[PDB]
Amino acid sequence: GMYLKELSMMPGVSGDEGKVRDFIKSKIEGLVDNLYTDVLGNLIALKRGRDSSKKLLVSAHMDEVGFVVSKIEKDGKVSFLPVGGVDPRILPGKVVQVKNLKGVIGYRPPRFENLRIDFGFSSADEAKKYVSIGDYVSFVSDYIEKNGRAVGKAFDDRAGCSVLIDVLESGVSPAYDTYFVFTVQEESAVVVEQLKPTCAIVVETTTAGDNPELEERKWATHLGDGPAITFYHRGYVIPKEIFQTIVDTAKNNDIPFQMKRRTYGVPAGVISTPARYIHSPNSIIDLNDYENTKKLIKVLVEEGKIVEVVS
């Protein structure tokens, strides 16, 4: 079926994506022709196509924002440093976890040095039996799904990963050798140099409502309006040919889509599932949008027009 619930809830902070990688592997092993972990930790799955003369690369990121244990205090509390972009102002009272041990961020009895995680210890010695400097701390969150909307954490980009797994579970017959890549944060010139793709499709999640006080509820990427097709990304060379192929594929397959509105070295396209923040770490996705994203990726893969337009 779908594993968004497990993907979302599972811990996999940048630099510590092992459990997420192991999970994805267990779900796609018998669905792909080849599957391996490259030297940086990226999971590379191959689905050979009718034509092996060209390669399509489709990718999603496994990592999420989090923290790292920087110090264990003599009273059992732990200090931490951010891993990714985190506003310390909203952290007090947040539940987090370190190696399956739940804790809560609070002030020490707008900085990280002023925050402490309380797991319930009284001494540094007690804390050490469960915790250590360098361990990864992730947010704790539930995943609830009702009336077509789902709420949980790390939808950016665990929804993208889930989309790829679902395309594979649905049984896909690619036009060209297609690599499904699940990436990690490294310490991409590598993945492209090793696979030499003709072109790439990056599957992301784009989240609106970042700033509640100055949020844009009308001129933004919206829940329910379909996957967003990026026109300009600055990080990826998105030629007109690719942009238009994606749009035409959508229109000819009756797949709703919207333009991307935000407040590798090879030709690429970017497709995003819309998300909206509710109470960070959590955000919301619309399941119809998710399904349309999956539909669009599957058609792009089976037709191969996206590969043919740049070669």
- Residue 148 and residue 145: Cα distance in Å, rounded? 7
The pair of structure tokens assigned to 78 is: 């732990």
Closest by CA position to 265, among listed 195, 216, 209, 208: 195
- Resolution in angstrom units: 2.0
Torsion of CA 126, 130, 133, 135, to 10 degrees: -160
Using an 8 Å Cβ cutoff, are 25 and 43 in contact?
yes
Residue 158, CA distances (Å) to 10, 194, 203 in order? 9, 24, 10
Q: Is 186 a catalytic residue?
A: yes
Distances in Å between the Cα of 207 and the Cα atoms of 21, 111, 215 are 23, 25, 12
CA dist., res. 40 & res. 11, Å (int): 19
Please list, in sequence order, all residues whose beta carbon lies within 8 angstroms of the beta carbon of residue 260, skipping any fewer than 6 positions away.
Answer: 206, 221, 228, 229, 230, 231, 270, 272
Angle at 296 between CA 260 and CA 141, to 5 degrees: 70
Q: Which of 186, 216, 241, 302 is catalytic?
A: 186
User: What is the enclosing helix (H) or strand (E) of 273?
Assistant: strand 268-277
Check: CB of residue 91 under 8 Å from CB of residue 118.
Answer: no
Can you say which residues are annotated as belonging to the binding site for Zn(2+)? 61, 156, 187, 204, 279
Q: Where are the alpha helices (DSSP H) in the chain?
A: 4-9, 18-28, 124-128, 155-169, 189-195, 240-252, 287-303, 305-308
User: What is d(CA 232, CA 46) in angstroms, rounded to the nearest whole number?
Assistant: 28
- CATH topology for 65-140 is Elongation Factor Tu (Ef-tu); domain 3 (2.40.30)
Q: Which CATH topology does 1-64+141-311 take?
A: Aminopeptidase (3.40.630)
Residue 200's identity, in one-letter code, is: A
Can 1-64+141-311 and 65-140 be said to share one CATH topology? no
The span from the CA of 250 to the CA of 191, in Å, is 28
Separation of alpha carbons 38 and 45, rounded Å:
11
Residue 165, classed as helix, strand or coil, is helix
Q: Please give the torsion angle defined by the CA atoms of residues 259, 12, 178 and 300, in that order, rounded to the nearest 10 degrees.
A: -20
CB-based contacts of 189, cutoff 8 Å, min separation 6: 265
Are 206 and 83 in contact by the 8 Å Cβ rule? The answer is no
- The owner of tokens 């009702």 is 146
Domain ranges of the chain: 1-64+141-311, 65-140
Single-letter code of the amino acid located at 31: L
Residue the block writes with tokens 């590798």:
264
Cβ neighbours of residue 213 closer than 8 Å, sequence gap 6 or more: none
